[PDB]
Design a protein around this ligand. Sequence first.
Ligand SMILES: Nc1nc2ccn(CCCCc3ccc(C(=O)N[C@@H](CCC(=O)O)C(=O)O)c(F)c3)c2c(=O)[nH]1
Ligand SMILES: NCC(=O)N[C@@H]1O[C@H](COP(=O)([O-])[O-])[C@@H](O)[C@H]1O
Length: 200
Amino acid sequence: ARVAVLISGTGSNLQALIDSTREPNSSAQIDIVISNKAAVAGLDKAERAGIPTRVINHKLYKNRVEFDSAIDLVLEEFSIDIVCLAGFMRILSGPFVQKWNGKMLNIHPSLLPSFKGSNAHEQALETGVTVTGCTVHFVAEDVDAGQIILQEAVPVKRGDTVATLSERVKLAEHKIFPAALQLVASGTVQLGENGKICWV
Ligand SMILES: Nc1nc2ccn(CCCCc3ccc(C(=O)N[C@@H](CCC(=O)O)C(=O)O)c(F)c3)c2c(=O)[nH]1
Ligand SMILES: NCC(=O)N[C@@H]1O[C@H](COP(=O)([O-])[O-])[C@@H](O)[C@H]1O
């Protein structure tokens, strides 16, 4: 399966995906890295890995649909089969999400359905949970319907901050995101016709 990774920042998840997809048994190949922010470290990791990069600036488009539509053109150009959102901090429009339904994965730093949204770690610390984690899920129009592929629990330790908690969670992200990509790319996991996860 041909995979595009969309990023917005450091790209530690991108690096984990690169490392895994280069393994001989990987059913996925990363053929393009797309960032909405220039000069982000994720672009360097891609270039070090010899992966084509494309910066698409959301701030240069008349609206989201024209911005998403720009991304979709790159995806078609590279004949992409699966889209991995790895730190992509730009909400995608309904028609784009509709087109790539069942083919777009996202990593979220919480045990969904808990702590949806942009500051999951802050929410988890404010709430006082002692167990958090991360989630790889199919991207749906409303984040409340995205089917879950893999999760991993991560302990919240006394005195944790966003810095220390996010660091611990990212170690789990770097495990379940490559595993989830491998599950989808191999056809072992798919969005069944009923809309729920289907294990083949
Ligand atoms: N339809 C759908 N689309 C997308 C795109 C990524 N994802 C994966 C979920 C990612 C969690 C997330 C990410 C970003 C924001 C956010 O606030 N974005 C601002 C700009 C942010 C900035 O300035 O850094 C904006 O784009 O307006 C947020 F609220 C929650 C999804 C998804 O799950 N569904
Ligand atoms: N779902 C939105 C969200 O909170 N995304 C989070 O951004 C980070 C990017 O890390 P990276 O750029 O080092 O991979 C990840 O920890 C990911 O869970």
